[PDB]
Symmetry: C3
Subunit: 295 residues, 3 copies
């Protein structure tokens, strides 16, 4: 796009603050930012806050979100749809024009691990170019396995295609399929959808821990067969809803936009790959690593 | 096919009548009928009753169906397989030759939302060319959320490929992916798998209602990531069996031939898109709309 | 590969023996063996024991497996990952060099129907070339429907691509998609992933029986929409874990590496096709038959 040539807007931190016992303000940007998705390969991504997937958002079940989008894009409108919320899409998920802001308010009344993404037509173009992320809604009553979990991380799967190519987006296999991790607590990694960072800087854990991953497959196009090598999921909550409780799964099927909370024990020191078991995607970049040490 | 050149047989209405407290007669045709699947694009479909997907069939759990197929096709045999039924496929799902009729009888002893389709080899050819549809079997004891539902519709997803091209059917991406809606009660829309009708004439509902959709992904080839923008499914029954009960899902994973009953509340006036969240398919036509008014 | 030219190593039988009330020894080979995947089409497969998928392994919940791999391949390293086990992947799923042996030990503490496969990079290459199979872990307390089942078989789905072509493995549609059956008890068929054997020598059953299938979709790349024509699954246990219990499903969604125990009644004599309902795959070979006789 001519107005995007040479544009690379520095990442802006997410802003969020609680404004009542059940209300939270959230302010994100829409911005065009170079991301290295594979070694030597820069995708000039359409992003929230300069990250793809965008920044993690976490609220409590029953929170109403007062959401502000500041469109830094010089020429393309953007918008936001959170899958967490009940809202009127033709009122509340509408476009914010270049160099403008818009504020929308809506409730998050269901617990889980929800995709969010731009809702601007063509939505496929916006998601593929990098406008996706996850919002976690914490159940008012937690999960029944909460006492057993020792450590937690968030992982997101997404695809990357040929650069802003709608033909490829609709009809082509993905060029890369990738994991990223978004921070829940200080010290957690916070990375972008690329083929390498979570291999070279693996997630960390300690021998014997029960790990929880909040996961979502944001697509745009592919389903995910989520698997952690060398373990079996003790407990899985589809879409992160506590009611949806499965046990002893080797692999979790995730639709496009599909989330889960999975929990597994790592019993031995060493490095545990984390994959989509659709191995063409795994080979095209969708392998993270978890390093488990006596530390 | 030479005998299909210029053939466009007018749609014939489904016939069905109850003949006992647990027996129902059903009579459908197999016919070759031009359907506009996208603006300007006519697919000379292989159809039941001149619709693709075919007409909706609804029976009660425990009903035995006495099924008659009248093959109006001048040259191609057709047949019918209902996924609802227990039957001998090599006896009961057999071909009916051109210009002949055949009657088969079999029980529907499980509740849910079942695909039906032609069972004539190559089955891929018959389904892709348009020989698919849904039969709903109503649970003897309803669903536990029945009292909460205010309005119901049926939606079906299917793909369309290059015209009667077996190479494309087996190896090619779909050209279109589409929703249609089939009527449950007088006044309900009854449409065909196309890219536009449910956008231009959206399904209707009223602010605050709990909506139930009986859905099925008939394929032939793709899985579906079913999602309704601006809401979360309060309750989902996999394959429409009341036992298979999930809560608070943002998106429902549907295999090829996969069904569900999903229920969600629309809280605000406006237009709610309904998608497969595999966005390449959504962009190739698989977006329906639900218009929610203070009416 | 030059060292594989003209190599066709005769299948070697699986070896397994119990060595304690909760310990079992297992010894498999890695070997290069010509398999006919379709009529006239020989794939020089990378295999365990000369079968693709490899031989069936069955242990009891709580068994520790002492596993030996003898690499007969003249030049390629191989390894083994069982999805059943808790293990350190970077210690326990490591390569065995040509003409060497390696022994690894790890527990199987969860019941179900688990994929196993080579864990040697690129893992996609190893699985696609034929290094996959299933290990069943029998629940300590069986399934709640055990008393109702009259007959059991194992079925595995896998794909075959152009011969050792990593580009095709990653980016290409499968050339064949196939079922095979592995023996649970003397007299059961034991076959390889091909387009024809289970059509020409169908599985056998008797009118009125409840059949259980232990199934797994090993991929490498595709999800499976598993369906048995002319019946509905009475009971399904996702991943073969008794807790994960669904009822009355027409079709079961299986991710890549995904397993299940499904149970269905055949009510009438005749031949029942067994498919992935993603019909492009079915047309490319993924149809088995079950012949049901008054015998
Ligand atoms: O299980 N992943 O190689
Ligand atoms: O834009 N569909 O959620
Ligand atoms: O034709 N398979 O249901
Ligand atoms: Cu309060
Ligand atoms: Cu506010
Ligand atoms: Cu955007
Ligand atoms: Cu969405
Ligand atoms: Cu009666
Ligand atoms: Cu009759
Ligand atoms: Cu037909
Ligand atoms: Cu079918
Ligand atoms: Cu003991
Ligand atoms: Cu030993
Ligand atoms: Cu190997
Ligand atoms: Cu694996």
């Amino acid at each position: 796009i001519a107005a995007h040539k040479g544009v690379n807007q520095a990442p802006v931190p997410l802003k969020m603050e609680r404004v009542g016992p059940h209300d939270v303000h959230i302010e994100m940007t829409a911005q065009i930012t170079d991301i290295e998705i594979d070694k030597g390969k820069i995708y000039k991504a359409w992003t929230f806050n300069g990250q793809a997937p965008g920044p993690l958002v976490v609220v409590n079940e029953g929170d109403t979100i007062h959401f502000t989008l500041k469109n830094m894009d010089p020429v393309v409108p953007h918008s936001m749809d959170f899958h967490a919320v009940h809202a009127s899409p033709s009122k509340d998920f509408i476009d914010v024009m270049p160099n403008k802001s818009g504020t929308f308010t809506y409730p998050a009344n269901k617990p889980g691990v929800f995709m969010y993404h731009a809702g601007t037509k063509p939505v496929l173009q916006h998601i593929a170019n990098g406008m996706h992320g996850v919002i976690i809604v914490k159940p008012k009553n937690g999960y029944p396995t909460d006492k057993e979990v020792d450590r937690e991380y968030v992982l997101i799967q997404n695809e990357w295609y040929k650069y802003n190519d709608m033909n490829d987006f609709q009809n082509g296999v993905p060029s890369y399929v990738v994991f990223s991790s978004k921070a829940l607590k200080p010290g957690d990694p916070n990375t972008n959808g690329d083929t390498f960072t979570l291999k070279e800087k693996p997630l960390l854990a300690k021998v014997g821990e029960k790990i929880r991953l909040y996961i979502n497959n944001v697509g745009p196009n592919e389903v995910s067969s989520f698997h952690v090598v060398g373990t079996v999921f003790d407990d899985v909550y589809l879409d992160g809803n506590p009611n949806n409780h499965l046990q002893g799964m080797q692999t979790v099927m995730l639709p496009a936009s599909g989330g889960a909370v999975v929990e597994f024990t790592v019993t031995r020191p060493g490095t545990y790959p984390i994959v989509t078991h659709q191995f063409n995607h795994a080979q095209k970049g969708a392998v993270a690593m978890l390093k488990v040490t006596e530390t």
